[PDB]
Amino acid sequence: EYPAWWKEAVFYQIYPRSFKDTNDDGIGDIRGIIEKLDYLKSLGIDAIWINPHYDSPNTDNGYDISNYRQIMKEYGTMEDFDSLVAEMKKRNMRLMIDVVINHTSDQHPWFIQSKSDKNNPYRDYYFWRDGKDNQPPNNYPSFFGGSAWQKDAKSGQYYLHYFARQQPDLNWDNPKVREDLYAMLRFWLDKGVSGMRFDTVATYSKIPGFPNLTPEQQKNFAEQYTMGPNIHRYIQEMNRKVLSRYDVATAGEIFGVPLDRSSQFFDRRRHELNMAFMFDLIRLDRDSNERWRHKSWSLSQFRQIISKMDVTVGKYGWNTFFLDNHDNPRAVSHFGDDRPQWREASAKALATITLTQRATPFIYQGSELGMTNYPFRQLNEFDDIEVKGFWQDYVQSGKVTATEFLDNVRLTSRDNSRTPFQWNDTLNAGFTRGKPWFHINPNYVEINAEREETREDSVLNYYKKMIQLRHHIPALVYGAYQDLNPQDNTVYAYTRTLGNERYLVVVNFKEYPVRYTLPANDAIEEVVIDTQQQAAAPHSTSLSLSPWQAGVYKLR
User: Cross-referenced Gene3D superfamilies, in alphabetical order (predicted)?
Assistant: First the structure.
């Protein structure tokens, strides 16, 4: 069974820039988070993961770090940070920070020096290569558009950046970089942080010789970058050196790692990472070649990916469960139906699922309210550099029309989840009194924390109840997972079994009523909860489900 606090906990993710502004400069800050801790405690949150909070030019809103030990000016001071840990600790909440060490900002002291000369001490802190000819070293693509190699006029060589140009990759091969990184980690751990979320941990190790990519590898380049020969070597070292020497829950974002390779990252026995963030589910409807394009998916596909994950996780690993985050579109829009008539119901349905999985649930800020995608009027309303990067590679190239491109990024852009949190119905949704740094969704007049707090049938209060059920029913945390019908495209039904305590979770994914027949030997003994306010106790053999109806039941 191997109990663990991080396995039973309910995590909340905060994107500071968009959580709460306290000085009215239009940007969310750390004091804003402090101000809302009571809101999150009442919600039932156990731990909080905050996106990057370090000094950064903000080319990638925090993921381009220029100083790992300094608090981002936009977010506040060290005192504010220390105060967050203290206030959180006071409320028995654990703080998990975002660790971005696959790369740094091109304005980081290490890169500034590395960039000054070919013989500078820090030259080997990054990857510099010569373009054998009148072009880059190889054909490596960048997640943010064009080549993953940037030419340095001065020296004449190219430096490597999987992501933005302003995000040069660190060289983990050099034992000096590793040590400076471990020192930096203990800096934060010594201050009380109880958890670390490692950004793109599968790409720390590069492929020796930087061979070119075959036509095939060109497509799934995201996966090739995880093919590093020293990845588990390095992560294991970081564990020995740091992780294993503090009580810290670790989560690794393994973007690009095939499912059959995730085990090596979270297998207890391997002493690497406690749990991981897989993307097989959240990206089930993304085209293979065009990462920005959305394609149709079905429930059978959805549930089948979940079964596979559970099997792969097995008895020795552990997983997280999330339907959205700062790099993806809103959960209700993506997996439910955000139209006015179905938003609440489908939101509650997804909530039911989110808190009854054999994984640690991560609730992204604002989705507990049923926040939705943003109504982007035109291309320039996106800040997403991934989008601007896609525009260059597919629209400038003529590979896709601007209209079709827009139709799609409207559904897949990470900016959908980056609009300011909606607290109440005052100007700017009570987020700020200044000008919001990024456009706020007009539906805030309907979807806002305050309004939902007083309404018993609100999405917020339903989330409160689901989290409360998870905190009180062990089976919902550790019970075995069983998909009663992997092929059904209408009703998602599964059991959670811990000994003789069996629970049944049912979700009507359709917008018309459906009658669900329980397995012949199964009987409903109790109703733990359901999305209908009225709906009385059903009988033992079947359920008449209304559109998007969800429920948890205890079986005999």
Answer: Glycosidases (3.20.20.80), Golgi alpha-mannosidase II (2.60.40.1180), Oligo-1,6-glucosidase, Domain 2 (3.90.400.10)
